[PDB]
């Protein structure tokens, strides 16, 4: 029983593949040998605890480095002219120009400038000194230690929970909606009201004076007497400076809307009310399902009773409760689908409605924070679709799902794949033809001959929000609508002042280039959805190979016969759609960074004239913003962007190195390693050294994964460098 | 910076010693015949 011990079939492999696949089949717990239901769910539960401990031990070190090597107090004194320091650098390979050039933010040595928005976050939430961040780091060290204790505890046989506890979906949803989403957002509200609002108003509220510092002039009297408007009585004025007592109000739960006029960020009183609202509604929504007390819902009978009587949905959702509850890949795919749609809702709502103080002014931090959640969301959504494919191979029972909606997806799967194919082809011919046409017209000396389409649907939606720039004047931009008159005394005085401003990123002025790149975005989502729906629905089998389910999920191919069956598996469709999410989110974040990099220095006409054709994208965005990127180090000297100039070139290595695994395939390298094995076995003084693992080439799935991971690492490092060097070196 | 010398200690151990601890202990572990 060698490594890997979870799979007996890989332990008898005498090659290097045994070393490789044991790393990659390490967390695929259900594919293990001598493996049961209880061990599956308990190992997944303790792996969740280890994941929670890693997240909290990560946050602890991102708090410890700000408290220890970062100037959080100096950034708190002046958040506009001080660069936030992540951590100090101890590199033995620096020369004296590198030590003298990485010393930023008034530090004593070479430090890294934090582009993660942790200073803006911790400032808005109430943390002011380094001692508060250190106490938070020790507290989250304790929390991660408690989660390690709980992870070890639930693997002990006294505290092992059974699968019936794990598959209790009603109790899990009630205690998740009530506890995880309700009492934590009500806990939050208690922080935002007790700590963050008085620290925005200058009052230092800590644990020593928690029971004495009253958050309102009349606290908990008007709450229980019903007059809640006392908590919205005296809001913060427009002369309020953040962190100071002057210009401040006393109301803890306002409904002002819009932005704080000095930080260009959301009001802590609004976010406190926001959390009291997504706390009351989640504790009320957490009393829905039936657990132990007679009242509630059984979701099995909800899904059984939700059948349309015309038969257009077949049996409806009958048999889907056992389908989700028995399949961990269905629950994980649903969780990652929801998580991608909310990690992208995170990205879309922290740039346009900045929630943290002095985050809108720090431009490259905002750029990093958008690109972060759009790449983490384009890998979470692809993981959702890949887990739908793994559900259809190793977890979907056609007998249990008989003529329900999930079986009817397989019944008309060629219609879904062909219509996603039509939509992708439509968007591709139209977007490419219009961009290439606008390229030809700028090439042929005639900018007026472009097909420029004003995006009047989304401009109509912006005028429906309150933008008076386009002059549609339908609702919330005209005073004759009932929605405006229902809102003009309640939230719209903040919202209209925030949306009619042209310096912020709240619902920006869009044009024909925005139309064209939104069809690029629709092309990217549609073609990624095409490959992923095609992988998920041809997961069990297809007309080329009907027994794809009996070959597992991530099998390489089926041989050169029947024309050729390369990339036939559903993992290979996931593999081909990782390139499409990289291209999609590359287009998304190209559009974001160029729409904002022209907004921040003022000349939005550069984007309005140049984004309609791809030579403007190549020249005015990829070439123009890379001026101080690749000049980070020269023969003459090196700048502070030099690490971002190396990380850019580094990306062009790793990405191109992926091509070595994605173009060249196995048997060339297998014969090459055969010649290498002969050469080592015949070389004098080196033949004495043996291998225990037989040297083989990388296997076919492993080759696609290694090329895909290299492609992804190079792709995220070329853009992390360019994006954090073409905004942080030319601020604006 | 509070203690400037812990950069000079932990970056050599977690950068040189700890991979030399981890990769040598794994190479023993992955090539155990058991």
């Amino acid at each position: 029983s060698r490594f890997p011990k979870f799979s007996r079939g890989l332990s008898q492999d005498p090659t290097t593949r045994r070393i490789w696949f044991g790393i990659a089949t390490a967390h695929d717990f259900e594919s293990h040998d001598d493996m049961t239901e209880e061990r599956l769910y308990q190992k997944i539960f303790a792996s969740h605890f280890g994941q929670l401990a890693i997240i909290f031990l990560w946050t602890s070190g991102n708090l410890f480095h700000v408290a220890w090597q970062g100037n959080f107090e100096a950034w708190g004194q002046d958040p506009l002219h001080v660069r936030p320091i992540a951590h100090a650098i101890w590199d033995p390979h620096f020369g004296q120009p590198a030590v003298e050039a990485f010393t930023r933010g008034g530090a004593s040595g070479p430090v890294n400038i934090a582009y993660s928005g942790v200073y803006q976050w911790w400032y808005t939430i109430g943390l002011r000194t380094n001692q508060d961040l250190y106490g938070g780091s020790i507290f989250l060290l304790f929390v991660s230690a408690l989660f390690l204790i709980a992870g070890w505890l639930h693997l002990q046989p006294k505290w092992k929970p059974s699968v019936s506890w794990f598959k209790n979906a009603e109790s899990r949803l009630n205690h998740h909606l009530s506890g995880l989403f309700g009492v934590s957002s009500l806990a939050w509200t208690g922080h935002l009201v007790h700590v963050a609002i008085p620290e925005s108003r200058g009052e230092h509220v800590r644990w020593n004076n928690l029971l004495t510092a009253l958050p309102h002039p009349q606290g908990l009297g008007p709450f229980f007497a019903g007059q809640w408007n006392v908590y919205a009585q005296n809001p913060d004025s427009n002369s309020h400076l953040f962190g100071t007592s002057e210009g401040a109000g006393t109301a803890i739960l306002t409904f002002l809307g819009g932005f704080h006029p000095q930080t260009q960020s959301l009001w802590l009183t609004d976010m406190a009310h926001h959390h009291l609202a997504i706390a009351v509604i989640f504790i009320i929504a957490g009393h829905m399902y039936r657990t132990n007390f007679g009242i509630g819902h059984s979701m099995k009978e909800i899904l059984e009773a939700h059948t349309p009587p015309g038969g257009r949905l077949g049996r409806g959702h009958k048999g889907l409760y056992d389908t989700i509850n028995n399949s961990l890949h269905f629950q994980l795919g649903l969780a990652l689908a929801s998580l991608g749609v909310i990690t992208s809702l995170v990205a879309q709502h922290m740039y346009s409605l900045p929630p943290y103080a002095f985050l809108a002014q720090d431009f490259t931090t905002q750029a990093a924070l958008y690109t972060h959640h759009q790449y983490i969301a384009g890998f979470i959504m692809t993981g959702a679709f890949a887990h739908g494919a793994i559900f259809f191979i190793r977890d979907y029972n056609p007998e249990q799902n008989k003529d329900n909606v999930l079986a009817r997806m397989l019944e008309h799967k060629e219609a879904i794949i062909s219509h996603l194919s039509w939509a992708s082809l439509f968007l591709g011919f139209h977007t490419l033809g219009l961009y290439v046409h606008n390229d030809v017209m700028l090439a042929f000396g005639t900018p007026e001959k472009q097909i420029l389409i004003e995006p009047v649907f989304a401009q109509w939606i912006q005028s429906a929000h309150g933008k008076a720039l386009y002059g549609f004047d339908v609702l919330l931009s005209s005073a004759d609508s009932p929605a405006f008159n229902a809102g003009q005394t309640l939230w719209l005085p903040g919202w209209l002042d925030a949306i009619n401003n042209n310096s912020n990123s709240l619902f920006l002025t869009i044009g024909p280039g925005d139309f064209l790149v939104h069809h690029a975005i629709a092309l990217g989502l549609h073609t990624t959805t095409l490959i992923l729906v095609k992988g998920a629905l041809d997961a069990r089998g297809s007309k080329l190979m009907p027994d794809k389910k009996e070959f597992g999920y991530s099998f390489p191919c089926d041989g050169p016969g029947r024309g050729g069956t390369c990339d036939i598996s559903a993992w290979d469709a996931f593999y081909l759609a990782v390139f499409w999410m990289l291209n999609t989110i590359g287009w998304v974040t190209f559009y974001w960074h160029w729409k904002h990099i022209t907004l921040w220095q003022g000349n939005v006409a550069q984007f309005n004239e140049s984004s309609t054709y791809l030579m403007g994208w190549l020249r005015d965005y990829l070439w123009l913003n890379s001026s101080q990127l690749i000049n980070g180090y020269n023969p003459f000297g090196m700048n502070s962007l030099s690490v971002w100039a190396w990380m850019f070139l580094f990306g062009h290595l790793v990405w191109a190195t992926g091509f070595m695994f994605l173009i060249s395939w196995r048997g060339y390298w297998q014969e090459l390693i055969e010649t290498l094995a002969w050469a080592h076995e015949r070389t004098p003084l080196a033949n004495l050294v043996r291998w225990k693992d037989k040297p083989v080439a990388l296997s076919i799935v492993q080759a696609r994964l290694v090329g895909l991971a290299h492609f992804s690492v190079g792709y995220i490092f070329t853009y992390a460098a360019f994006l954090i060097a073409s905004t942080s070196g030319k601020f604006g | 910076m509070t203690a400037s010398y812990l950069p000079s200690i932990f970056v050599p151990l977690i950068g040189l010693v700890f991979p030399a601890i981890t990769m040598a202990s794994l190479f023993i572990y992955i090539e155990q015949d058991e």
Partner: peptide, 30 residues
């Protein structure tokens, strides 16, 4: 700014956390 002795408190509490991470990894093995 934080002090010298507070770094000692953090390093012990991370070493205690590193033991509890080592204890879970032994139990995840078994």
């Amino acid at each position: 700014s934080i002090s010298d002795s507070q770094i000692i408190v953090a390093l012990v509490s991370a070493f205690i956390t590193g033991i509890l991470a080592l204890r879970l990894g032994k139990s995840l093995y078994q």
